Amino acid sequence: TIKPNNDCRQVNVTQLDGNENLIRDFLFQNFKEEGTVVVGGYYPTEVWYNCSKTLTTTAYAYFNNIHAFYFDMEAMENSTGNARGKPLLFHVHGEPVSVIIYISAYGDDVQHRPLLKHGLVCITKTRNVDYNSFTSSQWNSICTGNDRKVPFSVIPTDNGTKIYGLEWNDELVTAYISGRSYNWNINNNWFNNVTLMYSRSSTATWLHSAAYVYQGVSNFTYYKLNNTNGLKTYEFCEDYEYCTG
Ligand SMILES: *[C@@H]1O[C@H](CO[C@@H]2O[C@@H](C)[C@@H](O)[C@@H](O)[C@@H]2O)[C@@H](O[C@@H]2O[C@H](CO)[C@@H](O)[C@H](O)[C@H]2NC(C)=O)[C@H](O)[C@H]1NC(C)=O
Ligand SMILES: *[C@@H]1O[C@H](CO[C@@H]2O[C@@H](C)[C@@H](O)[C@@H](O)[C@@H]2O)[C@@H](O[C@@H]2O[C@H](CO)[C@@H](O)[C@H](O)[C@H]2NC(C)=O)[C@H](O)[C@H]1NC(C)=O
Ligand SMILES: *[C@@H]1O[C@H](CO)[C@@H](O[C@@H]2O[C@H](CO)[C@@H](O)[C@H](O)[C@H]2NC(C)=O)[C@H](O)[C@H]1NC(C)=O
Ligand SMILES: *[C@@H]1O[C@H](CO)[C@@H](O[C@@H]2O[C@H](CO)[C@@H](O)[C@H](O)[C@H]2NC(C)=O)[C@H](O)[C@H]1NC(C)=O
Ligand SMILES: *[C@@H]1O[C@H](CO)[C@@H](O[C@@H]2O[C@H](CO)[C@@H](O)[C@H](O)[C@H]2NC(C)=O)[C@H](O)[C@H]1NC(C)=O
Ligand SMILES: *[C@@H]1O[C@H](CO)[C@@H](O[C@@H]2O[C@H](CO)[C@@H](O)[C@H](O)[C@H]2NC(C)=O)[C@H](O)[C@H]1NC(C)=O
Ligand SMILES: *[C@@H]1O[C@H](CO)[C@@H](O)[C@H](O)[C@H]1NC(C)=O
């Protein structure tokens, strides 16, 4: 789904520390009964992407023809207290409205930013966005004018064991955070592509690091879910005709 890029490598998302049950908990969010079911949808698979650059040059990655975007972070420092975040910005394109997700770094030392709220949603009608100004300015003057600015908290006490996600169609947007999902009714023409800024130089809101993995989902995926005596297992169906027959 990603454009070719020498900075981006493939990684098994489950084998990273704290990610043993990352995909398991997402699949069983809605299946609460006992027994078996085969579910289809825009679910994440095993192999994700880690994009990083040792030099402090601004770098971008592009995902095309995707319906969903998921990402995962490492555990924050001092997660139970004054948690210090790591930065990540991406932009879901559409007309006449597009969406920018920005997660800033550092802690309570960022001026004017509400306490323990590292996440920002900018709903904007701007056609061309200057990401350098967005990620280099003071937090109070970032997403202003006619844009809609929504601060939100990641859950630092989750320690990066839960998946973060976004799915969209032309009538509804769904956000996945912690073990919960939020719905947003909006009529829009999404372009089905995402721009991601994974590295730049340190600023008042950005810290040079590589702490995220991400995946864009474009194809319909099938999982077989089995709940036996409270033991929850899953299997990725390569073809639907095999696991169901
Ligand atoms: C992702 O992992 C696979 C397989 O990992 C194995 O199964 C996991 C559940 C866990 O137990 C791992 O420790 C296991 O190794 C990797 O594919 C393996 O690659 C090695 C080294 O080249 C090779 O000897 C094995 O035969 C491969 N196994 C299979 C089943 O093909 C794969 O490299 C990882 N993908 C990445 C890092 O992108
Ligand atoms: C780890 O963070 C704790 C907790 O920070 C406090 O709570 C946060 C949610 C936020 O509101 C911070 O501003 C708070 O300070 C730190 O412990 C606090 O340290 C301050 C230092 O001025 C002190 O006044 C508080 O009493 C402490 N609160 C406690 C102990 O409950 C702690 O220092 C951090 N550890 C690091 C950064 O290593
Ligand atoms: C996230 O990690 C933190 C820090 O490792 C965990 O906080 C600890 O929780 C245990 C209970 O298992 C307490 O006894 C410790 O005192 C806590 N450590 C602190 C406050 O420094 C936290 O439980 C983890 N959250 C999860 C796993 O959801
Ligand atoms: C995301 O997709 C949209 C829609 O396909 C792309 O917008 C088109 O881009 C081409 C090439 O620059 C232009 O010629 C078209 O006029 C655009 N169509 C529009 C705006 O409706 C957009 O470029 C894609 N973005 C990325 C980063 O791939
Ligand atoms: C993504 O991969 C990079 C390397 O490509 C990882 O960062 C490296 O971490 C090791 C161990 O701390 C260091 O020796 C390297 O210098 C780091 N490289 C860079 C460019 O920072 C990074 O941890 C990976 N991200 C994950 C797993 O989330
Ligand atoms: C769901 O998983 C459970 C546990 O792995 C499976 O139940 C086991 O099935 C095997 C062979 O069918 C039996 O030998 C075991 O005794 C069963 N375990 C228990 C605790 O009953 C079950 O078959 C799986 N479900 C499906 C539909 O494949
Ligand atoms: C996604 O599905 C399309 C269906 O046309 C197929 O051509 C493509 O190879 C699939 N991609 C992956 C990564 O499975």
Residue numbers in the entry: 18 to 262
Anything the authors wrote about it?
To reveal the 3D organization of the infection machinery of FCoV-23, we determined cryogenic electron microscopy (cryo-EM) structures of a prefusion-stabilized S glycoprotein ectodomain trimer construct comprising D0, which we designated ‘S-long’. 3D classification of the cryo-EM data revealed the presence of two distinct S protein conformations: one with a population of trimers with three D0 regions swung out, and the other with a population of trimers with two D0 regions swung out and one D0 region in a proximal conformation. Furthermore, the alphacoronavirus-specific S glycoprotein domain 0 (D0) mediates attachment to host cell-surface carbohydrates, which may facilitate the entry process. Although the FCoV-23 D0 and CCoV-HuPn-2018 D0 share only 27% amino acid sequence identity, their structures superimposed with a r.m.s.d. of 5.8 Å over 197 aligned Cα pairs (out of 246 residues), which underscores their structural similarity. However, structure-based sequence alignment of these two domains highlighted numerous diverging regions that could explain the distinct haemagglutination phenotypes mediated by the most divergent domain among these two S glycoproteins. CCoV-HuPn-2018 D0 NPs (positive control) haemagglutinated human, turkey and chicken erythrocytes, whereas we did not detect FCoV-23 S-mediated haemagglutination of any of the red blood cells tested.
